[PDB]
Amino acid sequence: SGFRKMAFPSGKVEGCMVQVTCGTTTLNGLWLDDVVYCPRHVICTSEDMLNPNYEDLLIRKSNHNFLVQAGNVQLRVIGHSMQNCVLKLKVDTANPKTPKYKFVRIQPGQTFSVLACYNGSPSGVYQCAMRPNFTIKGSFLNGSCGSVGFNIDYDCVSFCYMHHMELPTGVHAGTDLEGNFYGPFVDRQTAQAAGTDTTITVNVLAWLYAAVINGDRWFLNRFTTTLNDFNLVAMKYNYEPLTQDHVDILGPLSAQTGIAVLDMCASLKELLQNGMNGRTILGSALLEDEFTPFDVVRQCSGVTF
Amino acid sequence: SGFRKMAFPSGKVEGCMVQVTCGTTTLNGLWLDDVVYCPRHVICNPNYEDLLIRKSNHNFLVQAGNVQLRVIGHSMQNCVLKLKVDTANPKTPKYKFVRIQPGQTFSVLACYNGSPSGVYQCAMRPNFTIKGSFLNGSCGSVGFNIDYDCVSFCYMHHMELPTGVHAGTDLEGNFYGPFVDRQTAQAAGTDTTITVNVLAWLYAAVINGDRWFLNRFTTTLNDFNLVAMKYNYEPLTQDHVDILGPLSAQTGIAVLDMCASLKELLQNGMNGRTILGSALLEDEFTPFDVVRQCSGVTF
Ligand SMILES: CC(C)(O)c1ccc2c(NC(=O)Cc3cccc(Cl)c3)cncc2c1
Ligand SMILES: CC(C)(O)c1ccc2c(NC(=O)Cc3cccc(Cl)c3)cncc2c1
Ligand SMILES: [Cl-]
């Protein structure tokens, strides 16, 4: 019993964190085999950030201009290339602690664990989700750039995010491990704002199923809804449209609890209308949207209370 | 910017998790040097000394990854069983066994069959239970903090109470709270809110640009403690006020100034507003957790 925002064990990622220094800038890098991956803005000053020409800045650099530190050991840079917004530093030593891994690009609504680092050293780990507006509500300070997001499915680490920057509203933006940003953001100091955020409906529904599994049914009602009428109501509360794919994904939770997806949709409709009236669901006074249907099956029991 | 319930990096603890099997029971153990620590109920009104005297070393199966560890000795210390093994753990970190106080927080590395499945942050509640996320097979999962490079082990999971909350011991086998390791009618006492933690969290909201709850008013520690007692809040002591000193200095808001803001939230609610994305007053962040997350301390 119990339900917590749970992160994946960070050990396999801690063994990959290195410190990258270029001139006066110092951020984190990901050391996998003989390559160190880090944000390409490590080559920039605060001046270049207004309109950086990365190709022109990088052509002026040599291997010895980059200092890579793995623990107390210095790594020698033997090559360098840019792939989109990520700089790939070829080093002379393969990481013996390299885990089995994949670079995956996630979709908004997907969750992942974040290993926050400063100077190549991990300071903390937390769970979070890719928001519909392609930003993450993380907890990062200056020096966190190069911190990575990941999922660990079975024994393989799936790298899905590299932290690059903080937007003016305090939210964060970054790229997949190929250097392709999530969202319409650029690694430039520009008046770019996060689009209006929306609630991840399929996740709130998954979390309501987790509450039913943990013995809480106070929110259920005798009503059902059409998929269209639910979306017409949910959009009024800034909720993401629930698609047929979402309904199909919720199938196993619906089967395990005996509550149809559109019957759960009806109680979400009522919850949005009535609020909680002093009650909580899984210890929360708000509707939680950072647990996917996959996270709920993973964390909750297979036997309903 | 941003404020999340953040756990310590679990890597130094993952390298210590082993699977312990005794007969039909299978739970987790902590392998430090040549000793495996696990709940003594792995051998299970139980007379533990009488059950243990009937066991031999080969009755215990210890699995570290795919390797089998050979048990060469065994002893009991309170509610924890210490299995002497033939191999020192090469991944043993620098460590200490510490007993924590209610209100203090720690990281939990949840495991099943000697394999870590997840990590999460939580606090020792005033009623000595933890609001964890555990399933059958989680017994032997450990709680820890990291101080520089040293792992402080503070909790070993033992059981789930009927209300869905959890109970366990320090690494010396001494339970937190009036609990016993056996199947009987045990209930968690009435819980209280950790006031010093809610105050620390209000300071974190001020640091992150949330000041709507601040007012021009102050209070005496005595007048606030009456209000704390009415709302099932833990009494705020002078030690708590002294501990909040650095947060008070960093934000320019006196502890009793912040206490008057909490008094108005307790008496009147949030009125549709949230603090750090929460509609409830959060009490599982200590004043040190607030400082550490709003600075950038690494291990
Ligand atoms: C101090 C403060 C505001 O809390 C802070 C300050 C900086 C933070 C940060 N670094 C940057 O944004 C560097 C940067 C600058 C311009 C463009 C680009 Cl692409 C990158 C990343 N995450 C959290 C950060 C938090
Ligand atoms: C099935 C369910 C509710 O998920 C569950 C069941 C058991 C759980 C568990 N173990 C026990 O409580 C076993 C037990 C019994 C009597 C005395 C003692 Cl000391 C221990 C620990 N954590 C989560 C547990 C969760
Ligand atoms: Cl995805």
UniProtKB/Swiss-Prot annotation, chain B:
Cross-linked residues, Glycyl lysine isopeptide (Lys-Gly) (interchain with G-Cter in ubiquitin): 5, 84
Superkingdom of origin organism: Viruses
Protein localization: Host cytoplasm; Host Golgi apparatus; Host nucleus
Regulation of this protein's activity per its record: Inhibited by pyridone-containing alpha-ketoamides compounds 13a and 13b. In turn, alpha-ketoamide 13b (tert-butyl (1-((S)-1-(((S)-4-(benzylamino)-3,4-dioxo-1-((S)-2-oxopyrrolidin-3-yl)butan-2-yl)amino)-3-cyclopropyl-1-oxopropan-2-yl)-2-oxo-1,2-dihydropyridin-3-yl)carbamate) inhibits SARS-CoV-2 replication in human lung cells. Inhibited ex vivo by michael acceptor inhibitor N3. Inhibited ex vivo by compound 11a and 11b.
Residues in compartment: Cytoplasmic: 1-299
Active site: 41, 139
Domain Peptidase C30: 1-299
Entry function: Cleaves the C-terminus of replicase polyprotein at 11 sites. Recognizes substrates containing the core sequence [ILMVF]-Q-|-[SGACN]. Cleaves and inactivates human TRMT1, preventing tRNA guanine(26)-dimethylation of tRNAs. May cleave human NLRP1 in lung epithelial cells, thereby activating the NLRP1 inflammasome pathway. May cleave human GSDMD, triggering alternative GSDME-mediated epithelial cell death upon activation of the NLRP1 inflammasome, which may enhance the release interleukins 1B, 6, 16 and 18. Also able to bind an ADP-ribose-1''-phosphate (ADRP).
Name assigned to this protein: 3C-like proteinase nsp5
Lineage: Viruses, Riboviria, Orthornavirae, Pisuviricota, Pisoniviricetes
